[PDB]
Amino acid sequence: TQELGANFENFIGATEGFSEIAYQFTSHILTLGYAVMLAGLLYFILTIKNVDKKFQMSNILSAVVMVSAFLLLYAQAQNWTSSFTFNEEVGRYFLDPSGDLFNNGYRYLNWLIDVPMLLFQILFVVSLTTSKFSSVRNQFWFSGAMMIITGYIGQFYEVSNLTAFLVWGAISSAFFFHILWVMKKVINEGKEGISPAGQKILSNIWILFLISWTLYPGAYLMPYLTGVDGFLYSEDGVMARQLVYTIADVSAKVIYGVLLGNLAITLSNK
């Protein structure tokens, strides 16, 4: 009974350990993660004036998302490098008992904060038609919260009880699907009576949103996408997971933000 190695990162780090390659790669990707968020922060601050007053709440929410993301992805970065330490004897990086162990808490918290704000911010750029601001807002915020919370629970049982890991994953996925359903409704109403240039950008937003957000359940499941014998159940699934999460974060926060800025600007022409 391995006791030291909560989550799969730890488990691997206690038993098999991490190649130089895996350790350093994961380090660097996480660093890139928070690097980009800091660049994002400056971008959204610096360009706030490029959109009409009435859209600026979207730029604001982007900046604030960037602040949270910088701070917590930085935390996550340092958490990674501190949780694992080199052993000359075996020539790999192993879970360090004198460190704090790898904690998903940082990222998941980032999600809890950022998800409501990301979902909200589009509603300051598009107009609804038949739907009510408050209804969409409440739907987003609730489902957003539930999705992240259920997932956070699930994540605990990842080593100890896969069956629960997945059932919580599934529950979370149900909330995810509702968010997709609502966001699609929003984008369609947002398209009504704007210029075709604006409808084009909204189309791209939908696709970015759909893809980027779907990366998350991917990275969650990543280590088990090959069986318990198979190839991803390894420091490789760890590498993959942290790569996909990072890609997702950048796309769903920074790029999403950029596109909305671009949408606002076209609405700022007709």
Ligand SMILES: *C/C=C(C)/C=C/C=C(C)/C=C/C1=C(C)CCCC1(C)C
């Ligand atoms: C900026 C961060 C964002 C937009 C995070 C989004 C996170 C999710 C959409 C997570 C979704 C999950 C599932 C749908 C199933 C597995 C558990 C989660 C939380 C990873």
Ligand code: NA
């Ligand atoms: Na170390």
